[PDB]
Amino acid sequence: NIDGYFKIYSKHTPINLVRDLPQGFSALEPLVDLPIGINITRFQTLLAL
Amino acid sequence: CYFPLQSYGFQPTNGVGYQPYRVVVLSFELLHAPATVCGPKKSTNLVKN
Numbered sequence: 001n002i003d004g005y006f007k008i009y010s011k012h013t014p015i016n017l018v019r020d021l022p023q024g025f026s027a028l029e030p031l032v033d034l035p036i037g038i039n040i041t042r043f044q045t046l047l048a049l
Numbered sequence: 050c051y052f053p054l055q056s057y058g059f060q061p062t063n064g065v066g067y068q069p070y071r072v073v074v075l076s077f078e079l080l081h082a083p084a085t086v087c088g089p090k091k092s093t094n095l096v097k098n
């Protein structure tokens with residue numbers, strides 16, 4: 001989030017179970033840009049049960 | 050102490066001053082936000098070679 005613009009990049013790939021953060025390379029293509037213009041200093045996740 | 054509320058009597062035979070009018074006020078502001086509510090409609094047909 002800079003100059004009043006919020007940017008989001010993403011990249012999805014299947015993974016082989018146990019190993020966490022495998023070796024490899026994958027660039028994150030842009031997804032979403034919004035000109036919200038808001039200060040952000042903290043954030044929190046969400047999850048469904 | 051008099052009644053604050055009142056209502057116009059809009060019969061069709063009223064004069065132009067008494068004729069009801071619908072007026073819309075279009076207010077514009079710049080509070081230094083990146084928001085934009087306009088857009089151009091100019092696009093000439095492309096040419097090649």
Ligand SMILES: *[C@@H]1O[C@H](CO)[C@@H](O)[C@H](O)[C@H]1NC(C)=O
Pocket residue numbers: 037038039
């Ligand atoms: C963000 O914080 C800065 C510095 O405190 C301030 O100047 C700015 O107006 C703030 N913007 C918003 C949207 O809170």
